[PDB]
Symmetry: C6
Subunit: 185 residues, 6 copies
C-alpha cells in the first residue's frame, strides 16, 4: 500500500485559494490505464498527463523499465475529495509522486513544491506564490521548491516567512527529483 | 445477506443520511459499474476505495488478478435518491473487501469517513445528522474519522449513550472493526 | 411470452402499463437498453442484470452466459419517455425468462424496485399504476410488501377486482410470474 | 432494390416518403446510423437489428453476422431532420434484404413501430403518411393493424388508389415487401 | 509531372457551403499505415461529417469493382481534411467529392486537373440534387475551374446561371457515382479494360 | 524523446510565442494532446501527425512507427487558452524531431497552417506574432509565403532585427529548422 503509493506535498490552486495539497499516486500491476480523481479541473488533469509523459520519456534514465506503462495502472488522487482544485502548479509534485511510486524511492519529509511542468522537463513559473508560501509556512513545511522564474516574487513575501523556509528555485525536473527523493534517482 | 453490504453514513438529497451500500463481484473480465444516482464526488470515492483494495490485495487475501477476472458492481438503493460527497469512502472500501473475500460485515455497524489512497481516514461534515440517522436505523456500532472526535461535543448525550462510537485513523482499523472474520 | 413482462412504471403520461422486452441473442456480453429510458430506469436495468448474474446457477442459467450472450432491453412505446426504478423486478423477471426459456404469465403485472440483494423496495404512484392494470384487464398484480398500506388510498372497487400479491424478494416474484417452476 | 426500403415517418416538414438505405459490408461489427436521425429513430434501428439477430437462423442469415459485418443505415436527404419510431419495420426490412441479398419491392411503402418480439405497433400522422405515399406514386402500403381505424379520417379518393395491407407482425411485412420469400 | 501527379492523389475540389458562403472546398485525403481508423477534420459540421461516412461506405461496398483489397484496406488509416482549418463548412453537397477523394487515396489514382464537383451521395451511388447551385458555380468560375460535375436533377437550375458562366464551364450532369469517378480520375476506376473491334 | 519547436500562434492572453512539445514514447498508437487547446488547434495536431505518417519513409522514420509509439503533443503554458491553425508547421517539425532524434534550432520560430499535401498556408495576426518573436529574442522566423504582403505593415525595427524566411512547403521548413 504505502509501498505502491507515492505521496508528495504540492502547493496549488483550490477553490478557496492556493493551498497545501497531498498528491497521492498508486502504481499497481495492470495494463496501462490512467485514472485521476480529486475534484480536478481540466488544466490540472492535463498537468497529470504531462507529468506522466515526462516519466515515460525518461524511464530508462530513472532506472524504470521503459515498457512499464503496459504493465501498470496508475491512479493519481488529490484529497480532500470534495474540494475543487485546478491549475498547473502541482505539475512537478505529480511528476515526483509518479517517479517515487514507480521506483520505490520515498519522498522526503518536510518538503513541499510548486511549479508547472513541461514535457521537456523545464519548470515554469506559477502565480500566487505568496499565498502558497504562507500555506507551507502555516503547515510547518521546512523546504519548498519553486520555479526559478519565481525568484522575483520572493520580494513580496514577509521577511519572517522567508527566514523560516528553505527555498530552492529550480529550473528543471532533474533538480526537483534530486531534492525531493530520499535516494539519488 | 451481509456479504458486500455495508451501512454507510453519507450525504443524500434528503439530508445527510444513511446508505445501504451493495456490491456484487462476479467472474468477469474486469468491468466496474457504479449505480444509484451517485454524484461525481461519490463516484470518485469508489475509484479511490477500489485502488486501496488493489494496492493491498495480497495482504487482504485477495487474488491480485481480480481486477482482470472479476466484474464489480457497486449499487446504492434507493435508486432514485441523489447521493454525493466523499463520506462513504471507507464504507465503499469495506464493501469491496467483503465482496471480494466472502467475509461478511458485522450486523448493526455503520461507518462514515473519506478514504485516501494511503488508507488514512479523513474527517467529514454533518456528523450530527449522520449519527441521528444511525440511531434511527438501529445501528449499535459507528465508525467515524478520528478528527471528527470534537464534533461529538455538539451531539445530544441521548444519541451518544446508545451508540458505540469508534474514531478511526486508518483503513485497517475499519476492516478489523467492520468485518466478521 | 418469453422475454416479455408486463410492468407498471412511470411514463411521461404518468404511471402506466408497459411491456418490458428482453432479447438474449448470441454475442460477447454487450448490454443495450432502449425505449426513451431515463437514467434512473437505465440503472435499474443494470441492477436487475447483476441480480441474474449473481444468481445464475441457482436460476438454472449457465453462469458464463454473459460472455456468450448479448442483451437488449427494450420498452415500447419507443417515443414515450419513461423513468424511475419501478420496473426493476420486471426487468429481472424478463431477463430470467429470456435466459431460461421460461414463459412469463400474461395475466400478471408487476411493479417494484429491485436491489442487488434481490429485495423488493416500495414505489410511488401505486394508485395510478393499479388503475392502469385494471383498465388493461390484468387480473394479478405483484407489488412491494411495503406498499400494502398504500392500497387503502385506492378505490375499493378497483382493488376488489385485483388479485394482489405483496412480495419482499425476487424469488417470490419469479415463483408467481413464471409459467414454469424456476 | 437490395437494402433500400420506402418508409413513411416524421421529418421536419412532416410525415413523408423516406428512402431507407442499408449496406452490410464485411467488417467486424461496426454499426453506423446517418441521415440527421433523432434519438428515437436511432433506437428503432437498434430494435430492428435485434429483431434480425433473434431470427437470423430462420431468415437464412448466419448468426455471426453482427461479428462479421459492418452495417450502415442511412436515410437521405442528409440535411433533413428525421425522428420517431415509424420507420422501424422499414429498418428491419432493409436489414434483412441487405443481409440476404433479397431485393425489396419498389412499389411497396411501409410504416410502423417495431418491437423486439417482432410485433408492429400503431403510429401517428397516418394521414400525412398516406398522402405522401400517394403523391409519391406508391401503389401498396403496409400499415400497422391497429391503425385501420385511422383510415376513415383520410380522403376516400386517396385510400381508393392505395392497396393497403394492415399487418400485425414482422414476418407478414417481410413476405409482402421482399421480392423473394424470406 | 510525377510530382504534380502524386500531389493530385486524394485531392478533390468540391463545391459546398462554408461560413463564407456556398464556396470552393479543397478536400484532402491521406491513406497511411494503420488499423482501419477514419479521421475527418476541417471545422466540419455534423451533416458534412455524415456525408463522409456515407461516401466511405460507398467505396467499401464497391471495393472489388474498385480493386481495393480488404487486406490492404484494414491495414490503413484514413484522414479526410478540408483546409482552411478554421473555416466552418457543412452540408451534404461535398458527398461525391469525398467519395472521389477516398477512391483516389486508396488506389493511388490521381484526380484530373481543373475539375470541381458538387452533389449529395447516397449509399446506392445515386447523386442527389443540391441547393445554391448558382453561388457554387460562381465560386467555380471565379476559381478558373474548367469542368464541373453537378447532379442531373440540378440541370433545371442552370437556367438562372448566366450565359458566360455556362460558356466558360464544361458542365457534366451526373446521375451515379460511377460516372463521377470516370470523369474525375485519370485512370478508369471500375473494371478491367476490354478492347473490341467490329 | 521530446521534440520542441518555437511556434507563433494565437493565445487568449499573453504573447503569441509558444513552445510546441511532442513526446514519442513506447506505446501502441495513442495520441494525446494538451495545453488548453481549442478545437481548430486540436485538428491542426491531427493534420501535422498525418503529414508525418504519410512521409515517414522519406523522412527516415519506420512507416509502421505508430504501432509501437504513443505521441503526446503539449503546448505550454498549460492554462493559457490557445487556438487556430498557426502552430501546424511547428507541430509537424516537433514530431519529425522527436521521431528522428534531430534537434530543432532554438533561435528559429515558425508560424503557418499545414495541409495534408505539405503546403504552408497563410495565417492571420502576423504583426502580433512577429512582435512576440521579437520580444522573445528570436533570431529567425519562418512564415508562410503568402504572408509576405503582410510584412509591409510590420515595424522596421522588427523587420531589421528578424531574419524572416517565407516558406511554401513543409520540406523547406524542415531543412531550415532541423539542425543536422
Amino acid at each position: 500500500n504505502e509501498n505502491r503509493v507515492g505521496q508528495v506535498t504540492g502547493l496549488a490552486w483550490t477553490e478557496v485559494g492556493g493551498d497545501l495539497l497531498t498528491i497521492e499516486t498508486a502504481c499497481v500491476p495492470g495494463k496501462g490505464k490512467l485514472t485521476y480523481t480529486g475534484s480536478l479541473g481540466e488544466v490540472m488533469q492535463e498537468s497529470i498527463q504531462a507529468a506522466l509523459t515526462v516519466v515515460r520519456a525518461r524511464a530508462e534514465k530513472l532506472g524504470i523499465n521503459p515498457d512499464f506503462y503496459e504493465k501498470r495502472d496508475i491512479h493519481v488522487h488529490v484529497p480532500e475529495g470534495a474540494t475543487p482544485k485546478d491549475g498547473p502548479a502541482a505539475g512537478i509534485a505529480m511528476c515526483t509522486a509518479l517517479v517515487s511510486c514507480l521506483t520505490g524511492n520515498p519522498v522526503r519529509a518536510d518538503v513541499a513544491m510548486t511549479g508547472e511542468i513541461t514535457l521537456r522537463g523545464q519548470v515554469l513559473p506559477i502565480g500566487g506564490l505568496k499565498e502558497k508560501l504562507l500555506a507551507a509556512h502555516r503547515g510547518g513545511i521546512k523546504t519548498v521548491l519553486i520555479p526559478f522564474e519565481n525568484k522575483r516574487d520572493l520580494e513580496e513575501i514577509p521577511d519572517n516567512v522567508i527566514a523560516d523556509l528553505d527555498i530552492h528555485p529550480v529550473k528543471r525536473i532533474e533538480e526537483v527529483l534530486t531534492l525531493a527523493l530520499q535516494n539519488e534517482p
